[PDB]
Each structure stands twice: as structure tokens, then as C-alpha cells.
Amino acid sequence: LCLSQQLRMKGDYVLGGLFPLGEAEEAGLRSRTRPSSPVCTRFSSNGLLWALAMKMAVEEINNKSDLLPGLRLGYDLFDTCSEPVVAMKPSLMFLAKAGSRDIAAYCNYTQYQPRVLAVIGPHSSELAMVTGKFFSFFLMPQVSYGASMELLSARETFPSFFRTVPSDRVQLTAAAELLQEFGWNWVAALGSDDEYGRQGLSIFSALAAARGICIAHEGLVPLPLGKVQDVLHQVNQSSVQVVLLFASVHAAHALFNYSISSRLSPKVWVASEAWLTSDLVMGLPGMAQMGTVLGFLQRGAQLHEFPQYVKTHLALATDPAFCSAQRCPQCDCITLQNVSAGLNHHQTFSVYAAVYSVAQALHNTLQCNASGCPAQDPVKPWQLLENMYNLTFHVGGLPLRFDSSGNVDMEYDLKLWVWQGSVPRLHDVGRFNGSLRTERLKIRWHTSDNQKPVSRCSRQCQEGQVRRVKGFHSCCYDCVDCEAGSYRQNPDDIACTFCGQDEWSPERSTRCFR
Amino acid sequence: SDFYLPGDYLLGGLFSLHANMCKEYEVKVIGYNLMQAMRFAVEEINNDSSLLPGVLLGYEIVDVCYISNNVQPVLYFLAHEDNLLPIQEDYSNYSSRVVAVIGPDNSESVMTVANFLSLFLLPQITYSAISDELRDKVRFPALLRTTPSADHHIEAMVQLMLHFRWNWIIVLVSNDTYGRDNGQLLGERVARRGICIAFQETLPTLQPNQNMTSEERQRLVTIVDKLQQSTARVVVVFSPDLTLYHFFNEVLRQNFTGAVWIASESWAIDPVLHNLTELRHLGTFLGITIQSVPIPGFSEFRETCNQECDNCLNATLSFNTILRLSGERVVYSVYSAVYAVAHALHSLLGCDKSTCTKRVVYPWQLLEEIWKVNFTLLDHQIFFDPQGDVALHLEIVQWQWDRSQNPFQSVASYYPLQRQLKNIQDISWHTINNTIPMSMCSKRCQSGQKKKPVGIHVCCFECIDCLPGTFLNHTEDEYECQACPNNEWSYQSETSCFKRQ
């Protein structure tokens, strides 16, 4: 076929694009002795899907007369093989002046002239950070699908970063609202042993303290053995019924595999989105015994016409007449057998929206009239940025907005797992848009009597009961009714003291008597 | 000016002269100290004809105060000697303006610069950057460190705690990477050894030049109240220095006393925190830092953008007193880094005592040679472990307030190759009669008295007598009593049974 050659498209303005067209060979991960650019060959469907989706979005912008009237908008896509080393080279290429192969050093770059107008950013948050630190110095506007880490919202370090997916803090505030509204206070929080889960733990630990939720244990579970046994043992020794599992897929898979292997107890699990789309996790045969699973999932329109477009253009890509119309081997050896699994992935909309945003931002920057654009000097990136920072735009007829933190405002659904025998299915229970609404009466529980489980702590005692502090931050108390025959001693002391040989006192007594 | 010196080969240097145009932030004494330290090192290497004959070794230095400006000096170092920088699939034949970079000291900027220099395999040596993830040579192939890792600092803390038998500690962490990562690492280390964390709390980020809000004050008040009511009197602190000035003042306002404070390497040697008079009331202050090695002749040497400093001399002229009393602890890292590059370069050129057969030094070859050096400086062997670390001695210090004495007294020495704490000397405690301070969740039980756990922490247990008809076999179990044989009895709390009908 001839499909790599389509990854570049001339125009009056050009969008840079970063996608994982390939994947690194997990078995090799060759270490480097000499400073050559690494190469990858292993194909992956979803990265190419997003690439085609971008091509589709730019094609739509070119077809329509309303946006960028009479201009030709192009694109320039490159393969980020998940490595910072691989991703950095095209990041530099984006900045080399037109026709050149060189990037001159300067003390300042508001004066400079890069060859692309904006960069559609990489999927993963690690590459998002690495490339954002570089791009933001040049004030190159970067619009990212996929990357959700909240650290990228900080404008003191990422002044030019935007994204069409909500950051983790929205999901975790929804989770905190869920915990508070249901009246649970005593919970355990596990993150995966990667920066996604660890930073999620930081965010959730900060959020919970504002609402009285006291974390019984704040643990991390490894990615690929005694560690999981220790973590689950400490969670089991805690009298916790509600567990937050903000994990990557493989870590959750391992945790549940061992929990089934250990005949673990059933519990309420609150799910990360990455786990919640659980096709390979929910297939574990023992999963039904683990207790009820809830989680917050994005809601957004699918790019309904996408599969037909992919069919059409992969049919065209093998037509030798179309070949009469560069940077990836094995991209030209792809047919629908390889690709036709991910066609429904919602990331395609986020990619689609991303392109639209830049187009609209340029359209507002040029101030093009509906009949045609005014005469203009070639627009610069830092000229887009100031108009883009407060944008409102329409994608598929849906309105969208960037606030100054760079995130889109988008709502979430509460999803519950329902067991059709051995088949688990996702079902809808509620909605979150800054406040939480739930169909409480529609939930089914794992307890034999189908009633809500209880997980909470007494945050104050009464009558001078014996107190013990508990919780990872020491914000819960457990209260003990000191038994008749011993007395409180000091009302803040750890334990009671016994009366004399001929003395006695009642229950909870702060005194001793005869 | 000091920031540039020509030569036949050049070293790049990144130093944080200001806190967080970097001049807008407050000048830091230690940053300027290390800035001049590198100058002394290069002066020595240019003087000694035996180390690099027929070669002048130059340097260029740029300020990196914080995560702000890090991209600029990297692009400025990598240029092809005329501000150009070609985009290549292979850089094997490329002459960068510097052959090596003496990189930053704060983890975020270190990683930021390393991710960029990794493309060219330009060797980077960083001083005093601790984060353990820097041991990953697949993620960071080009990076080496003249400092022990966070692993060793935490292990030294743990062995200090074990030696004086402290089971019950409070951990305070700043609201950023330095606090969070080291708090997690300490959490991993502590649990396996029988020590227990009473609770962990995140300190709110505050600045001495800024007014504290009432919300932040309430947060600090809550933390200090938790400190006040708890039985754990050992406090470990992971924070940059600036946050602490408010914190301790609040601690002083609430009349807290009697704790042992363990300072991590970020603030264990801060002169400014040391200067406050009232900290004497808060108990003993201990810290962990790399050992003093005296650089000979050094002190009387210290007496196109972001390459300047106006405040440095005026701000340093006062704290130079404390520096002169102190042990030059971090200077040796920079000194050794420059000497390591010098030896690797000498052997890369195949140079004799007489002359060097000069060649275009492509940085990847200099990295290949830097991996192999092994030599003595000031009677200490330096060579790189495969992960890129250099085995400097760690040292535990007590803060001493008899002014005009040495302000940071050595009390123990930690050897990393042996992973062991040794040569412990006297620590003068705050206690009423200079006894070792005590902290456990509960007191050790009497004989014949079994242990009953109070919570998740193994460190916490009640004591309960074994009843008549049972005895406690300490040698085999201690959490439950044992029944006496078929014709024996016991007198409640006792270790053994006796014969009775």
C-alpha cells in the first residue's frame, strides 16, 4: 500500500502532530553506545487510528468554507515511539526554519520563525511533560489528547499547554464527592507504582482532608511479589470496606489476580478510568466475588462517521492510481485486519476536537470574514496563544471552552458493574458536573441483603471515653468504653487505670469509689 | 567577569545562584560557593602541567535558579560553535561547544537537562541531586553523580533510629517532589525494620518574604496540635529551607519542646536556619550530609544572558564567617566532578606526561572513558559504580549554638560501600540529666505478661497477664499464653508451670 506518504500535507499553515504510530520492541529495548536516533518497527492500531482521525479533522476544515476561508491547512505527523529520546528529534524538527535542517540558538525566541503553527501533542503524560517543557520556552502552542496529569495545569512551568481531556483532579473530586455524599469516611487509597498513580495519590490525599475522609492506608502497588501481599494485608487489617484503586491496567490486573488467588474479602472498589475500561481485567474468572465496582467515566460524542472514512481511505490506499499523489516502515503494510478493532475509541474525538481548536484559534487570530480573510502578515505561534487562552468553539455541534488552566470543562458519568451471570457489563447510575447526582435506589450491592456497606470512623468521642487516634494522618478516633472496675485516669490518656483492693467504679467512670 | 574562561576544550557548568531573569529571586550563599568552587578546580587543573600538558581547560557557567530557564543554556551549550545546530539521524561526528556539562543540583532541572542531553550522549555530572530514579541508565544513559543516593541517606537515618532504639516517629514532608518521594522511600524502609510512622503530614508551602494567610495558619496550627498531643517525639523533616522559617516560629508560639529533629540533606546545613536564637528550646537538631573533606588552599581563593550576579558578594560577605567555620561539605563534589572529567579526557587523548596527540573529542567517547576512571583525590578513592554513583562518606551532625565554635558538630560516620553507621560519638541531649531520649508506642511488658496488639502498627501493644493454669513461653511465642501440662499449674504472671493436683 501507499499510506506513509500521506502523512505530510502542504498548506499555507501547517500543524505538527505527534502520535505513537509504532511501539518499542519490548523484548529488545536496545541500549545505546553511539548517538543515533532509535527506530521502531512494531505496529500498533490505535496510534494509526488517531492519525487518520487527525487527517479526517483537517480534511473537514479544508472542505468547509466557514473556517479559514480560502486557506489551505496542512499537517506534518511524526512517530513518537513512547521514548523521550525518539520524541525529541521531531520536536526539534518542528522548529527548524522552512527548507532548512537547522535550529539556531538564541537568547529569546519571540523573534523566531518555526515551520509549524501548532503541535498536536503526544498521548502519554510523560512525553507530555518532556515535550511541554521544551515547547513552552518557544511559546509554541501545544494541544494534547490523552495526557491527564494535573501537574501539566501549572502555568508557572507550562504556559503554552492545552488539552481536550479533563485532568485527573476532576475525576478525583468526583470520587471525593461520591465518598462524602454516601457518608463513608474510612477508606484505603492504592495507586499504581507509576507517576500517574503516585500523583493521583497526592491529589486525592489533599482533596480528602478538606472533607473529613480519613485515609486508613495510602499504598502503592507494583506494575509487573510480596509487595502486594503486604499492601493487601495492611488493608485487610484495617477495618475498611471502601478502597480507591487509582491504578494502571496491569497493576490492577495483578492486584485482582492475587486477590482471587488469596480468596480476598469482597469490598467496594472505586476505579480509575484506565482500569474502568476493563476488557482484559473483567475477564478474570473470579472477578464476580470481589464486590461492587464503581467509577467515573468521561461522556462525549463519538466521531460517528470515522469507521466509514477509515474503510474508504484504506480501500483507496491500495489503488495504484491513488499512489500517483516517507517516515514509517510497516505503515505501508497495513490492512483492515490489523486496524478494525479500535474504530470506536473515544480518543478519536479528543484528537478531532484538538485540531478544530487550533483552526478556530487561527480563524479568530486572522479575523477572517465569512467572505474571506483580510490581508495579513504570516501569523506566529505566540500570536495564536493569546487568542487561544480564552476560547469557545463548536465541535460536532457541541460547545467547548478552555479556561486559563488549559483544561476543557466536561462532565462525568457514574458507572456501576452489573453481572449478567458470568458477563460483567457497565451501567449508568449518575452524573457529575461540579456537583453530584445519583440514582441511589438503582444500585445493587454485593452484601447478601442488598444494602449499602458501612465504612466510617468516630471523629469525636463522648463522656470522656478512652481515645485512640488512627488514620494515616491521625484524623480518626476509636473510642473505648472503659469497663467497670477501672477508671479513666487523665481524660486524654491512652488507657484506663485499675481501682484498689476494696474499690470499684461504674462503666466509663472517670473516678474510683468505695 | 568570572563566568567565562577560554581554552582548547570547554566544560559547561550549571549552578543555581538564586532561589525561587533569575536575578528576580533571592541570592543563595551555597550556590555562589559552588560557583567559585568550580573556578578553583579548573584553576588547579590548568596549573598542574602533569595532568593535562599542552592544553588549556576552559569553562562557561550559566545561572539556573529553578525549573524556569533550563532550556536556554542547554541549547547554548550544544550549538556548533556558531549558534547553529543541525538536525541529524546520527551525531557521531558532531562537535558540540562543550565536551561535558557539570549539571544542576535540583532533581527536576537535572532530569529536564538530562532528557535533552541524552540525544547526543553528552556526559553530564550532577552534584548533590539525590532522586533515586537517576540510577536508571536506560532512561538516563548520560548522567553520573558525585553524591550518594537518597537510598543511603534514608538508610543512615534508619540505622541511627535503630541504634538509639526509636520505634515511633512523625514524618513531615513538603508539598512537592522532594518531600513526597523521600516520604515514600522512608515509608518503604521503615516498615521492614520494625519502626512505625505515627502519622505523615504535608506542610503548606510558605515563604519568609510573604504574609501567611489565615487558612495556612489554621493548617499549621492543626499540624502543631497533632504534634503536641502525640507520644512520638522523633520528627523527620523533608523540606526545602524556605518553608521552615514560618513553621518553626509557629512551633515556638505553641510552646512545643522535647523533640529530636532529623533534618534531611536539603536543610541539614543551612546557615540561615541555624542563625535563629530560639531553636535551642525545641530540642536536639540532627542532620545528615556528606562528610567534610578539607580542600587545600581553597578558602583564600574565595576571599549571552543569565551569566551575572550583583548581590552575590555583598550577601556572602557575612555568611562567609559560617562557611569558614563549616566543613566545605558540598564543595568536594564539584571538585571531584571536574577532576574526573580531566582524567577521562587525559586518557581519551591517550596523552603522555609530555604531550597529547590532539583529536576532535566527540562527547560520546568521553562518556565511554568517564565510565572507567578510578583514582585518588585528597586520599579518597573516586570511581563510578555501574549506576553512576560515587561513594562519598555520609555524616550525621548535631547543630551546635556555641558561636565562634564549629556550628555543625560531627557525631557519626556512614560508609555506603558497607551500608553501615559507625564511629558514633557523644550527642548532648536536651534531657534533664543528658539521658538518651525515649519514644515507643508502649512500654515493654513484665515477665509472664503477653502482648495484645492495639492496631495496625506492630509497634503498639497492651500487656495482659497470663492467667493461672497457663504460662508464657517467650522463646517460642509472646502474643499468646501456653497451657500447662496435664498435671501442672501456674501462679498467674510467671514464665513456667509447676506440679499440682
Ligand SMILES: COC(=O)[C@H](Cc1ccccc1)NC(=O)[C@H](CC(=O)O)NCCCc1ccc(OC)c(O)c1
Ligand atoms: C527541588 O529542589 C528541592 O526541593 C531541594 C532544594 C532546592 C531547590 C531549588 C534549587 C536548588 C535546591 N533540592 C535539594 O536539596 C537537592 C536534592 C535534589 O533536589 O535532587 N540537594 C542539594 C543540597 C545542597 C544545596 C545546594 C544548593 C542549593 O541552592 C542553590 C540548595 O538549596 C541546596
